[PDB]
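CI: structure, please.
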Amino acid sequence: KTDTSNRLKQIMAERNLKQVDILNLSIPFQKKFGIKLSKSTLSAYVASVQSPDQNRIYLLAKTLGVSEAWLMG
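Here you go.
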């Protein structure tokens, strides 16, 4: 499993957030930064299928209020 997948799952556990909740929290940041994130893409990240690019790492770090550096693994 990728660092990022693990790190996302860690955050989910710490905060009792499901993917649907993360995606919803990301929406204002998607709009703020002009960075899109789909349900399937987020699912693929959590599943360790895909690794986020620079923009989505940034988006997710702002959404979750965590360090970009940490989320990158």
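Notes: The domain at 1-73 is CATH 1.10.260.40 (434 Repressor (Amino-terminal Domain)).
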